[PDB]
């Protein structure tokens, strides 16, 4: 009737990549409840394949830190 496809994750990584397009703290990411700063674009492109890349303004970053801790 209506087939369901249940997919299981394999990466063992829970989090997201965050940046701004305005006027910037560069590319930063939360990996398994730990905040880390990305230095190169290669790591950004690599992690984008496993975790989502979202946009967070510099003003809102402080509020996200409290919730992700």
């Amino acid at each position: 009737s209506k087939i369901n496809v249940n997919v299981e994750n394999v990466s063992g990584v829970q989090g997201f990549l965050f940046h701004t397009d305005g006027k910037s703290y560069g590319y930063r990411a939360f990996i398994n409840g730990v905040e880390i700063g990305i230095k190169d674009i290669e790591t950004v492109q690599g992690f984008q394949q496993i975790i989502p890349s979202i946009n967070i303004s510099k003003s809102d970053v402080e509020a996200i830190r409290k919730a992700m801790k």
Partner: protein, 430 residues
């Protein structure tokens, strides 16, 4: 069990359907609610009881199927629509397909039951095959007898069943004819016949060689991978990319994934993804092969020989000719579009699910055409459908070149355009 006499069972099956027993209005609808029984058919595909059934019954009357016998059989088993088979939008639509199936069974001949899955053939007390052939056309027996295996075994081979029984290798089943007659009386189906029918086809089709089966799960993975790969425009998206690249770590472990069960899933995936210069040179060479046996002598061989002459690859191993990559089914002629994979050369598509449609515009000479499991109207197919090639057509009639029609060979046959398109499940254009 065998609660009734041999004469009574014969009289119950000799009943035409047709015959509603004079219980056509409210009384049969009121019984359907209480006998539940019909609980899964009442809950799923929600119908507004007796009043909505009074809108459902004329559809059975339009298809010439007994209102009483259809509602009784719906109570017999449920579910997984209405009777047997797998899936199909609405209850009224789901009912129409079931009636269309009976049309492709009540006139088509199928060899009688006497048990086949899980060993031991039932020793008879010859008369069953004589009785099934004794029955003329659109009778309740012509619908029941080929479908119900457990019923025939307890009526025509009762002596064997009582002496045995029996778990997995022996007789484990009961008598569904007893359960049907007991519930039908709860109308007289024996006295009605004696105090119908007096009226006027034989089944077509077989199955290809098939090295199957080792791993069905491998076919299920590709079908889902290609489904998202063809629908990549919606993802191109973070969650969408995770759904597209979901197939890397295995495995989709399914214990009950049978050959019939895999095909139902594979055809469900197919109906979602779906919605001349090369042919012209070999066409003159193919017309000379008419009247001669090309296989094998089966429908798949003539299709295989024609495809290998145009594209390069064949279907039947006896034509041989290199084989096409088998991605599904396989065994049945419904369908070859639907397994084999013609992306390797050139494909048509035009997959027609359950009901309907036909599509006269999607012809294109000379495409490989597929016919439904049970036609019945032009070819009178059974289990595995029919296949051939289209030669020419008019807005009235269609000329086709096909092999195994009641024992082959390659014969040029003309059928009604509307009647032929009704039998169609899919086409493959070059």
């Amino acid at each position: 069990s065998k609660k009734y006499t041999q004469q009574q069972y014969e009289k119950y099956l000799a009943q035409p359907a047709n015959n509603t027993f004079g219980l056509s209005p409210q009384q049969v609808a009121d019984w359907f609610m209480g006998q539940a029984g019909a609980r899964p058919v009442i809950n799923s595909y929600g119908v507004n009881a007796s009043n909505l059934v009074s809108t459902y019954i004329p559809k059975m009357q339009e298809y010439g199927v007994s209102y009483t016998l259809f509602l009784m059989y719906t109570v017999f088993e449920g579910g997984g629509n209405w009777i047997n088979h797998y899936m199909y939008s609405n209850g009224l639509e789901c009912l129409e397909h079931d009636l269309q199936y009976i049309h492709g069974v009540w006139e088509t001949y199928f060899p009688p039951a006497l048990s086949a899955p899980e060993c031991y053939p039932a020793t008879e007390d010859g008369a069953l095959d004589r009785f099934y052939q004794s029955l003329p056309g659109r009778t309740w027996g012509d619908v029941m007898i080929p479908s119900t295996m457990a019923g025939n075994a307890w009526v025509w081979a009762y002596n064997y069943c009582v002496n045995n029984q029996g778990a997995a290798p022996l007789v484990y089943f009961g008598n569904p004819y007893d359960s049907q007659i007991d519930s039908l009386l709860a109308a007289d189906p024996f006295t009605g016949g004696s105090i119908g029918d007096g009226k006027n086809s034989v089944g077509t089709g077989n199955a290809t060689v098939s090295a199957s089966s080792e791993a069905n799960r491998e076919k299920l993975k590709k079908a889902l991978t290609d489904l998202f790969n063809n629908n990549l425009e919606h993802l191109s998206e973070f969650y969408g990319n995770q759904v597209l690249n979901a197939m890397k770590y295995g495995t989709i472990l399914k214990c009950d994934l049978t050959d019939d069960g895999l095909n139902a899933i594979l055809q469900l995936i197919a109906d979602v993804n779906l919605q001349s210069d090369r042919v012209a040179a070999n066409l003159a060479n193919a017309q000379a092969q008419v009247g001669k046996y090309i296989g094998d002598g089966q429908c798949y061989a003539w299709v295989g020989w024609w495809s290998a002459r145009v594209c390069g690859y064949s279907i039947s191993y006896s034509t041989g000719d290199p084989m096409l990559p088998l991605i599904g089914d396989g065994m049945n002629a419904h369908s070859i579009h639907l397994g084999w994979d013609w992306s390797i050369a050139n494909t048509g598509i035009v997959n027609y699910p359950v009901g309907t449609v036909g599509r006269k515009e999607d012809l294109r000479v000379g495409a490989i055409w597929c016919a439904t499991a049970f036609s019945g109207a032009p070819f009178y197919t059974g289990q595995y459908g029919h296949t051939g090639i289209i030669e020419s057509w008019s807005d009235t009639t269609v000329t086709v070149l096909e092999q195994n029609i009641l024992g082959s060979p390659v014969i040029r046959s003309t059928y009604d355009l509307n009647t032929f398109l009704s039998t169609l499940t899919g086409l493959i254009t070059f």
